[PDB]
Design a protein around this ligand. Structure first.
Ligand SMILES: O=S(=O)(c1cccc2cnccc12)N1CCCN(Cc2ccccc2B(O)O)CC1
Ligand SMILES: [Cl-]
Lengths: 18, 341
């Protein structure tokens, strides 16, 4: 699912600014 | 006439902002006025601690920035800017700066403590917000951006990580290092990958319209539980953002999808918030038909969600960190760089 792909992306925690 | 009342309100707000911008407050407390309770967050050049004001017993969030680390990581201007903005703005959905001061080692910003914590953690815990729940938060961001843009400020830092939920269930926007005065255009590549508007990625001159794109990303993430553009690496996220393609969960309403198609619009001549009617194109959209904008501003709407709170100093909505010393050097560090703080 799209959710599964989101989890697979590894970017589920707090995200830093570039 | 509401329109004339809004214009008068915003003109008064701009006068007050510019007065405080030109003559900032400085040195309104000192460190030994506070007891430390708990570390609420850590970063590459600072920390945030729950503190108690010894004289009053009031709790505050104290952001502590290591001056040498700020200099190392090239954040002097952003840090000075954040404090100057925070002491000059006044709006119900912006965090309140109560005190600021500095010593040989650190800069200190003391803000009202919001025990409900970040939207981010509530969102990840519950999974996703229903559309009325997302809409309640979205309306507050719309009004906050209307205020900030009227001051010629671009916000550039929207994401659930930078939104707190207070004891009445309303939003407090936290961070302002990236908030720049832009009457025309600006060029810096800055923000968070998932929330970057295409014109920032494509290295264009850009304006306040990037905030309305970011609103679209936020609404999508709140309502879906995940952002519209994601990938393993930022570069792959950027390719998706600029493509002009986006898919929606099947549970998204027609009205929601229509709003998002107009906010997540890669063409600036078509993006809601950037047209001749400005923010009213958003406020008058069908998805917001049930929103009482004045009642939201007055915090008279019943919040859909109230965080659990067991006292003015409860820290249960924040992560646990190793408690480290707050060392103040015997030598003044970086005094000239931070003279205005
Ligand atoms: O710790 S916060 O949730 C926070 C921020 C502002 C007021 C607060 C009032 N009550 C409670 C928490 C509060 N928080 C929200 C955003 C995340 N950062 C990350 C961070 C961590 C360490 C140093 C700096 C930064 B920074 O931002 O630039 C810390 C601030
Ligand atoms: Cl995290």
């Amino acid at each position: 699912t799209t959710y599964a792909d989101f989890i697979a992306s590894g970017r589920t925690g707090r995200r830093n600014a570039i | 006439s509401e329109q004339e009342s809004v214009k008068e309100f915003l003109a008064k707000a701009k006068e007050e902002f510019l007065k405080k911008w030109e003559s900032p407050s400085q040195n309104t407390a000192q460190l030994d006025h506070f007891d430390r309770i708990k570390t609420l967050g850590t970063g590459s050049f600072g920390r945030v601690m729950l503190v108690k004001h010894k004289e009053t017993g009031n709790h505050y969030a104290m952001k502590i920035l290591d001056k040498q680390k700020v200099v190392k990581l090239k954040q002097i201007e952003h840090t000075l800017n954040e404090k100057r903005i925070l002491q000059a703005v006044n709006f119900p959905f912006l965090v309140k700066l109560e005190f600021s001061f500095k010593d040989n080692s650190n800069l200190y910003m003391v803000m009202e403590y919001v025990p409900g914590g970040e939207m981010f953690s509530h969102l990840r815990r519950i999974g996703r917000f229903s559309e009325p729940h997302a809409r309640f938060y979205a309306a507050q961001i719309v009004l906050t951006f209307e205020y900030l843009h009227s001051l010629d400020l671009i916000y550039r830092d929207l994401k659930p990580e930078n939104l707190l939920i207070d004891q009445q269930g309303y939003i407090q926007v936290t961070d302002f290092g990236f908030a720049k005065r832009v009457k025309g255009r600006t060029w810096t590549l800055c923000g968070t990958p998932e929330y970057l508007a295409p014109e920032i990625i494509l290295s264009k001159g850009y304006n306040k319209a990037v905030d309305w794109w970011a609103l679209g990303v936020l609404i999508y993430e709140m309502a879906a539980g995940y952002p519209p553009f994601f990938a393993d690496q930022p570069i792959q996220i950027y390719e998706k953002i600029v493509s002009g393609k986006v898919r929606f969960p099947s549970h998204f309403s027609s009205d929601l999808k229509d709003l998002l198609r107009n906010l997540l619009q890669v063409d600036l001549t078509k993006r809601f918030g950037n047209l001749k009617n400005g923010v009213n194109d958003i406020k008058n959209h069908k998805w917001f038909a049930t929103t009482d904008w004045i009642a939201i501003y007055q915090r008279k709407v019943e919040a859909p969600f109230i965080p659990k709170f067991k006292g003015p100093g409860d820290t249960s909505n924040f992560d646990d960190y190793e408690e480290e010393e707050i060392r103040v050097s015997i030598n003044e560090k970086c005094g000239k760089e931070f003279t205005e703080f």
